[PDB]
Amino acid sequence: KNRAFLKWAGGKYPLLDDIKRHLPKGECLVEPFVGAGSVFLNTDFSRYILADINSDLISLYNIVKMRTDEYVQAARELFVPETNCAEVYYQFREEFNKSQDPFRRAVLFLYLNRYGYNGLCRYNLRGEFNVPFGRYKKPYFPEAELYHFAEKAQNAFFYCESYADSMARADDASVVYCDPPYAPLNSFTLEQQAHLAEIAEGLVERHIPVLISNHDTMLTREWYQRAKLHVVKVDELLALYKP
């Protein structure tokens, strides 16, 4: 398995094998909620369309893809011993929330991901990144994973859009994998949870396959009723809409 250079909520690898197991074959793979990229990094599709509502995440990715070397250097500089204390963490966080330069924010973003509390990515109502210091003993600088990501991203495209817009890019050779925010065991609402299933129902009729991942609850079985369901031992459900 290829680790993702970022720390993202949930953890896709913790189910990775079973996903490749029901993931239809095809030319292009479409991930409406790319996330940390666990699925992307661990598959061999010809092309990739990766999207996410988080702008900071996509900016980062496009940069890692286009300016891999330049980045890795600037990034590496922040993982020295001189920056491993709350004192600095809150300084870099502030520099980030105030920055207007895409590149500088992409660098700080990684540092925040690694030195921040539980590697969370959260913002307050003002739109500022508001995660606290994680007090980690020795943060790991993902240099190996950055490059691997960068190399594989050469056959990928990153978009910053909602799930509906990205899934609307899938063609006959495309195959859709959806990893939306987990169901109840702004924010991703129940109304949208259903809208996604509704869209899946739509694509599958155009003969475009779609695989959805989510908890296994009364609500998920309800939304994904029109799909071959397979439980994975709260549990984990995989919904497959096969043409």
Ligand X SMILES: Nc1ncnc2c1ncn2[C@@H]1O[C@H](CSCC[C@H](N)C(=O)O)[C@@H](O)[C@H]1O
Cα distance between residue 68 and residue 205, in whole Å: 39
Query: Which one of 40-48, 49-57, 77-85, 230-238 is the stretch in contact with ligand X (CB under 6 A)?
Result: 49-57
54 near ligand X, judged by CB under 6 A: yes
Q: Which residue has the tokens 């960068």?
A: 150
3-state secondary structure of 165: helix
The answer on whether 52 is annotated among ligand-binding residues is yes
5 near ligand X, judged by CB under 6 A: no
134 near ligand X, judged by CB under 6 A: no
For residue 212, the tally of other CB atoms under 10 A from its CB is 24
Total binding residues toward ligand X, as defined by CB under 6 A:
14
Q: What is the DSSP letter of 137?
A: S
Q: What is the closest distance, in whole angstroms, from the C-beta atom of residue 165 to ligand X in the complex?
A: 8
Quick one: how many helices (H) and strands (E) in the chain?
10, 7
Q: What is the closest distance, in whole angstroms, from the C-beta atom of residue 111 to ligand X in the complex?
A: 19
Candidate list 26, 35, 142, 209; residue touching ligand X; CB under 6 A? 35
Query: Which one of 30-38, 62-70, 85-93, 146-154 is the stretch in contact with ligand X (CB under 6 A)?
Result: 30-38
Q: Give ∠ CA 44-49-52 in degrees, rounded to 5.
A: 120
The answer on whether 8 is annotated among ligand-binding residues is yes
Q: What is the closest distance, in whole angstroms, from the C-beta atom of residue 35 to ligand X in the complex?
A: 3
59 near ligand X, judged by CB under 6 A: no
Looking at residues 157 to 196 of the shown chain, list those that interact with ligand X (rule: CB under 6 A).
162-163, 179, 181-182, 188
Strand spans (E) along the chain: 28-31, 47-51, 156-159, 174-178, 210-214, 228-232, 236-241
Q: Is 80 exposed, middle or buried (0-12, 13-18, 19+ CB in 10 A)?
A: exposed
Candidate list 2, 10, 97, 120; residue touching ligand X; CB under 6 A? 10
Which one, of 16, 22, 23, 19, lies nearest residue 2 by Cα?
Answer: 16
Q: What is the closest distance, in whole angstroms, from the C-beta atom of residue 189 to ligand X in the complex?
A: 9
Site residues (CB under 6 A) for ligand X? 9-10, 32-33, 35, 52-54, 162-163, 179, 181-182, 188
The annotation places the binding site for S-adenosyl-L-methionine at: 8, 12, 52, 179
